[PDB]
Amino acid sequence: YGEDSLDVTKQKHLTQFEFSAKNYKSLIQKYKVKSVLSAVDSETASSYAKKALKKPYKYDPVLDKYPPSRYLGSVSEKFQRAVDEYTQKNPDKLIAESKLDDSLLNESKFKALMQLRYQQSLVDPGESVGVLASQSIGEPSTQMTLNTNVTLGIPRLREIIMTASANIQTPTMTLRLNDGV
Amino acid sequence: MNIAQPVSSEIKSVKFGIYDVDDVEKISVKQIVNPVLLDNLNHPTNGGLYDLALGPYLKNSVCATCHLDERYCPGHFGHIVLPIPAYHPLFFSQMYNLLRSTCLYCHHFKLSKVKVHLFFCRLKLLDYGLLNESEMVENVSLAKDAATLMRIRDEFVAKSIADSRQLTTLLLHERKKVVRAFYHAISSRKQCDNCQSFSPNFRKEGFAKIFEIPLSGKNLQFKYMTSTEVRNHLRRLFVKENVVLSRLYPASADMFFLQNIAVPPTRFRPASKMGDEVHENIQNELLTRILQSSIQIASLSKDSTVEERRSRAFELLINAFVQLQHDVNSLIDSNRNPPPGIKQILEKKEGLFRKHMMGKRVNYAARSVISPDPNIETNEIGVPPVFATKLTYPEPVTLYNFNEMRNAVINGPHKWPGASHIQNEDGTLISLMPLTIEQRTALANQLLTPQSNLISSPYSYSRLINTNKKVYRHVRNGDMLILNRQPTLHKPSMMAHKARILPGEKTIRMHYANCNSYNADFDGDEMNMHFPQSTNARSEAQFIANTDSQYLVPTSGDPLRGLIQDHVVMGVWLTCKDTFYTRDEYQQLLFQALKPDETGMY
Amino acid sequence: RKSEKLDKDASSKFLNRYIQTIEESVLSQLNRVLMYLKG
Amino acid sequence: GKAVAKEDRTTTPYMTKYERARILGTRALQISMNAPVLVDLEGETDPLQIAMKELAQKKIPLLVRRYLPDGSYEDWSVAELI
Amino acid sequence: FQVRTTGPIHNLTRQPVKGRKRAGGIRFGEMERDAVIGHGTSFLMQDRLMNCSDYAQSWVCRDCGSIISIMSTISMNGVGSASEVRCRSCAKPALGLEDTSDIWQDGSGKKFVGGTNTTLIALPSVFNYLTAELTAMNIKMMLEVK
Amino acid sequence: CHFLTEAALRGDVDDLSNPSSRLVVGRVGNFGTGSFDIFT
Amino acid sequence: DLSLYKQTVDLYLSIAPGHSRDPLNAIQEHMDSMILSKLPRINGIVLAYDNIRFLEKSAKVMYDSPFSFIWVRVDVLVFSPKKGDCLEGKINLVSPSHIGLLILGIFNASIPRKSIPKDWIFIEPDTTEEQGRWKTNDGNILEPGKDLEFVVDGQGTLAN
Amino acid sequence: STGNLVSNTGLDLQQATGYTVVAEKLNFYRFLSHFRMVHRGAFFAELKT
RNA sequence: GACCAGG
DNA sequence: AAGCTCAAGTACTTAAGCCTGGTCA
DNA sequence: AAGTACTTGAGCTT
Ligand SMILES: [Zn+2]
Numbered sequence A: 001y002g003e004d005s006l007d008v009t010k011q012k013h014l015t016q017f018e019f020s021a022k023n024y025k026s027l028i029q030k031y032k033v034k035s036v037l038s039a040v041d042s043e044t045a046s047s048y049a050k051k052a053l054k055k056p057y058k059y060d061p062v063l064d065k066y067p068p069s070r071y072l073g074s075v076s077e078k079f080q081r082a083v084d085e086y087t088q089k090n091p092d093k094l095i096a097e098s099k100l101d102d103s104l105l106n107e108s109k110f111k112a113l114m115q116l117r118y119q120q121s122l123v124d125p126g127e128s129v130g131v132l133a134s135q136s137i138g139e140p141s142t143q144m145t146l147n148t149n150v151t152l153g154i155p156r157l158r159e160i161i162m163t164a165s166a167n168i169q170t171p172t173m174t175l176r177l178n179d180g181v
Numbered sequence B: 001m002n003i004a005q006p007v008s009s010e011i012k013s014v015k016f017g018i019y020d021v022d023d024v025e026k027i028s029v030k031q032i033v034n035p036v037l038l039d040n041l042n043h044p045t046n047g048g049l050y051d052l053a054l055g056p057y058l059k060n061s062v063c064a065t066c067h068l069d070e071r072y073c074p075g076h077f078g079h080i081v082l083p084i085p086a087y088h089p090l091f092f093s094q095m096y097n098l099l100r101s102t103c104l105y106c107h108h109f110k111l112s113k114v115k116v117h118l119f120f121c122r123l124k125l126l127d128y129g130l131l132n133e134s135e136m137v138e139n140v141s142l143a144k145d146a147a148t149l150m151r152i153r154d155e156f157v158a159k160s161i162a163d164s165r166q167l168t169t170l171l172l173h174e175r176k177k178v179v180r181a182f183y184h185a186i187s188s189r190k191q192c193d194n195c196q197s198f199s200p201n202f203r204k205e206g207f208a209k210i211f212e213i214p215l216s217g218k219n220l221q222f223k224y225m226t227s228t229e230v231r232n233h234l235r236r237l238f239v240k241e242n243v244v245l246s247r248l249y250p251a252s253a254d255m256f257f258l259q260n261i262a263v264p265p266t267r268f269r270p271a272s273k274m275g276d277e278v279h280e281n282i283q284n285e286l287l288t289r290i291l292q293s294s295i296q297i298a299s300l301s302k303d304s305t306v307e308e309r310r311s312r313a314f315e316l317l318i319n320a321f322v323q324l325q326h327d328v329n330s331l332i333d334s335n336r337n338p339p340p341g342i343k344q345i346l347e348k349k350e351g352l353f354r355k356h357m358m359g360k361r362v363n364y365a366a367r368s369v370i371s372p373d374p375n376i377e378t379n380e381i382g383v384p385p386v387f388a389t390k391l392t393y394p395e396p397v398t399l400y401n402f403n404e405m406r407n408a409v410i411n412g413p414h415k416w417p418g419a420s421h422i423q424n425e426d427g428t429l430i431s432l433m434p435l436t437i438e439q440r441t442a443l444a445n446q447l448l449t450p451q452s453n454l455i456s457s458p459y460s461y462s463r464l465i466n467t468n469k470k471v472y473r474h475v476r477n478g479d480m481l482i483l484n485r486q487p488t489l490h491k492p493s494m495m496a497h498k499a500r501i502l503p504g505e506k507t508i509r510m511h512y513a514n515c516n517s518y519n520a521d522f523d524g525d526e527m528n529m530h531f532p533q534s535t536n537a538r539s540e541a542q543f544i545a546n547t548d549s550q551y552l553v554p555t556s557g558d559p560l561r562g563l564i565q566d567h568v569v570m571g572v573w574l575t576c577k578d579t580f581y582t583r584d585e586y587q588q589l590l591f592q593a594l595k596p597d598e599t600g601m602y
Numbered sequence C: 001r002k003s004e005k006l007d008k009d010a011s012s013k014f015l016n017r018y019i020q021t022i023e024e025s026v027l028s029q030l031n032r033v034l035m036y037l038k039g
Numbered sequence D: 001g002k003a004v005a006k007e008d009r010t011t012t013p014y015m016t017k018y019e020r021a022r023i024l025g026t027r028a029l030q031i032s033m034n035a036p037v038l039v040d041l042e043g044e045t046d047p048l049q050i051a052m053k054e055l056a057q058k059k060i061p062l063l064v065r066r067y068l069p070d071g072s073y074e075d076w077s078v079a080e081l082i
Numbered sequence E: 001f002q003v004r005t006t007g008p009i010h011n012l013t014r015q016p017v018k019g020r021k022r023a024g025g026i027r028f029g030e031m032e033r034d035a036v037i038g039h040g041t042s043f044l045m046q047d048r049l050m051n052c053s054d055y056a057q058s059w060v061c062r063d064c065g066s067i068i069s070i071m072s073t074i075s076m077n078g079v080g081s082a083s084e085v086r087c088r089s090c091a092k093p094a095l096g097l098e099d100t101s102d103i104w105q106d107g108s109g110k111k112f113v114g115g116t117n118t119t120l121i122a123l124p125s126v127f128n129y130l131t132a133e134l135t136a137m138n139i140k141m142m143l144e145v146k
Numbered sequence F: 001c002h003f004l005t006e007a008a009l010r011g012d013v014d015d016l017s018n019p020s021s022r023l024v025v026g027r028v029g030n031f032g033t034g035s036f037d038i039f040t
Numbered sequence G: 001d002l003s004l005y006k007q008t009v010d011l012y013l014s015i016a017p018g019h020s021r022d023p024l025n026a027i028q029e030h031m032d033s034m035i036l037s038k039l040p041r042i043n044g045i046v047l048a049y050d051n052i053r054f055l056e057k058s059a060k061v062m063y064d065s066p067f068s069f070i071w072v073r074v075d076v077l078v079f080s081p082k083k084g085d086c087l088e089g090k091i092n093l094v095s096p097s098h099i100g101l102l103i104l105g106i107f108n109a110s111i112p113r114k115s116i117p118k119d120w121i122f123i124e125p126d127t128t129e130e131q132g133r134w135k136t137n138d139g140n141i142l143e144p145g146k147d148l149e150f151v152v153d154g155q156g157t158l159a160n
Numbered sequence H: 001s002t003g004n005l006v007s008n009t010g011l012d013l014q015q016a017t018g019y020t021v022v023a024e025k026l027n028f029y030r031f032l033s034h035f036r037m038v039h040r041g042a043f044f045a046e047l048k049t
Numbered sequence I: 001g002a003c004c005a006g007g
Numbered sequence J: 001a002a003g004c005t006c007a008a009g010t011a012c013t014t015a016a017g018c019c020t021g022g023t024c025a
Numbered sequence K: 001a002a003g004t005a006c007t008t009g010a011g012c013t014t
């Protein structure tokens, strides 16, 4: 589902990586770690996540190797890049060096928490999605049609997504200047 | 629905296809030959378009064939014969291009047989779903040479199927490509690739009348006519080239021409009484026309056999033939012969497939203009007393809610929280409206008891005993009853609210919060209230679609609900640091905000 | 819809095992017929 | 086709947003039809809140078959799901 | 305000009529369908679109796969047992000696043999109407059951 | 009637894919709470 | 002939709700129904049934209703009569309109006077006017010869 | 009664129908605005511009 | 079913 | 000659939901 | 009105 992180209706708070680390005591209880860590596999896919993050290729995106349903180790690339570069970019909330940490925090612990929410936030299979995209076009197609040179809005969308016609009204191109010129 | 009825079948598919000449007579239950509809005694004419055997004409008349009343008679077809048979109107154009592809003297294809057999191998290998393997078989470059090429295609397909053995989407993508290439090949050719003759060309009309001039003198050196001639020539075309046409379609009996069309039962074609006028209908009338033209064909054919005398004979006979072709075209395609035809009542897009199948009027579903209420909840929805007392739903009766259903039937169908009318397990429904409180008490006393007057009363299938009496009761404070407003653009437009029942007023009540979802201004616009009857439906509704569980509109992530105008600016006035409250106001305000008991939990 | 054989002694044994399996009118008539067939 | 064995199951162990719905629904209907209440009632009347009182205790019948799009299925009890 | 608990129906398809003068029902579909089938409420869809409006029990021949071909038996015998429906298209004429069980008769008086694969499937009345008009166009859909 | 005439000539049998088709004959849709089956 | 045959059939039983504990008793509630009644498939009237077992396939719930479904395989002993089968019965009632017999004590036989040739004559005893011995052309009394044999017509025939 | 101007020639009027409207006296302003108003024809109405 | 209305 | 891609030109279905009134032959 | 794909005839090359 384009790696999905979910169907959009819940994937929102992923980017709020500060929010979870801010409290972190209520979210862990919400996700119910004691019952989830039991049945699902954790170590193997988390190990392979680093191997996929290896900059050279021949390693798939971890999501293809290990589906995100049972292996509590797979997340898209950008999600893991985000959690890593957040841990290194904003290290203020997370403590650190390591001994002082192990009272109330742990970088690996909180990263495993975010891993866990990603697992907890997949598309629940069986969701009729096509009709979801149908609503996602219909609603804004209603929203704004009075403008505030190419035509913008529903006449435009009518060509790209409905008629897909050759010889559109104004097919233009944009070319970047180069230093030699 | 009923909860008892078990029906076991699980339909896995439907299969479309033509209908041949034997089965139309197998399903025949009578023949319609007399045009007259009704006699002086006004009774259903025997054998007429309203014959009693076709379908039970109302005023309590039992059907002849099945001999049981109208409430259960399912109607039976009838046949109306024609020795003309006119070619089926819907396939007229494809039949036309096929006729163009015909070579009358040759009775093979205008295309080279080797090319049509290439076409045959294409479909043969497509049947098992092998795409590149189909484009492979053309990899040959070379009548005798032509027969060798055909045998090369045969051996290619032979090894391909041998390796393969040891619908789905992409199948149709190729099987339509072959159809388009088939036409591109067939209609381009004029002279016979097999016979070397120039079979005469053919000219048609949009009125579905076809023929052209005979051959020219030069090509001989090298209009309108009967349908039996066309039928026989197409029979030769098919049976001589059974393979590629069988792949295209082995059966070729009545594909293009209909030897007996069926009159559907009277149940489907009623004589609606609007005021006083009694018009039979459009379809009865047009079937009458084709029947009269059929008997006219019979008489005129007899006149022909009994014998410019031959000229007048053939002219008048062809006139009768073309008239019957024209009127059967009218029946099946009212787009021709300028009342609705069948094709137009289907394809009209005002009628079926859009106005009776996808979306249909529904029972147990009321409707009102809607005022706002902030006091109830964000879950709950107001329900006026009229909707409560009138919207009914079944409730099985068990050991532990017998008390509630007892009280319900004690109250009756005229005073909330009463129930409406009691269903017995056999399948009947006995009302409580015409009864008295004494009678209702009596009937409610024997509400939990096996009353079926045997172990197996209906017949020797004894599960009817197990199911409990279903009491039809009114909605109450916990039931989940859907809401919607058209246009329903995006999914939070329909939701499920818990009912709360109010006294007096005549319009439902909702909370401000949900409003921005349904996109209403509450100026006096109105919303459909529904009530799913069974328990599976209301269960899945209450859980998946409970208002709060639709808190994120799914185009983006941002929240679509929320508090609104007064609440928000008074929020800016309460959160502001300039406001101070004493004990009295603080206690009072906190309590008004919580409202524990009705919500509960604390 | 599968069909097999039933011989004489097989009828007696099958009625025996049936009266032993599920446990009034039918059983009464079956006891009558079993008493008439035996003896 | 196949009926997937217990040793290798690919499906997701989470009691989905849907299996919860249908399970609780059909269970409430069952219990509405004079069925075995496998949990001591609290006097609760609604033929569905009993079903939730049961599923909270994970004492429910009705394993669910998850159809893979191939045509095979895996059969999960409700206690087994998360 | 218009409320429709139970009321008059349509001559053709037995869907509630288009009223407010004839207690007509409210329309639910062609976008209301998209709403629920986005909500993922297949049971609600099958309930409202089928159960509440137009519900029926109809018989089909499993052998031939036809729904027009069902005829309920007449004059089998005295009170005896119930009318056990059969299929005409898959039945052959009564010429010849056959056992009393499988035979049955016609209202006109004809006897037949065959056509016993008649089961009891739920089917919305509108599909019955579609079968009628379709076979009037001479083309009939053959639905299988397994 | 055009799609009808072509799919009728060829007689192409679906299983039946979309929920509109699953619905016209009244059966529960493929999607949603209908995707799986529940057994005792 | 040997008219009795055993048929192990497969039928599709509905497991009612209150019997969701065990299907076996739920099998009973409807297996006691068909007995001594006609099942049209097997072309015979049910006599008895044993060997009740359900093929373990995790019985299915009808997908809008609370009672489930399951295949059960059970062996019936239906009396399958054919044209030309020969049947015996003990005579109970006799009259100069037909002959009355019971086969297996359960199944009735009422054979009109037409199927009896005019060769057999009725004697009327002075004690009971209706009941009386239906002698043959030979002079044999049939009342002590309670076991009487004839053929199936569909109803019997003693005319050869 | 209806408004179908049925004449052998249209007399240079585009639409043949709708020339007449009931004077619903529902409220006086509606009575006036029936008497004053004009309308330019359904032929242009059906066009979406 | 068609033409004017109306939310 | 005639084969075969090229050109304008001829037939041809859709245009949001609902809901409620009225008049009409 | 918009625009679609559909089909036929006239001019150029082997
Ligand atoms: Zn009938």
Ligand SMILES: [Zn+2]
Pocket: B103, B104, B105, B106, B107, B108, B192, B194, B195, B196, B197
């Ligand atoms: Zn030829």
Ligand SMILES: [Zn+2]
Pocket: E061, E062, E063, E064, E065, E066, E069, E087, E088, E089, E090, E091, E115
């Ligand atoms: Zn049949």
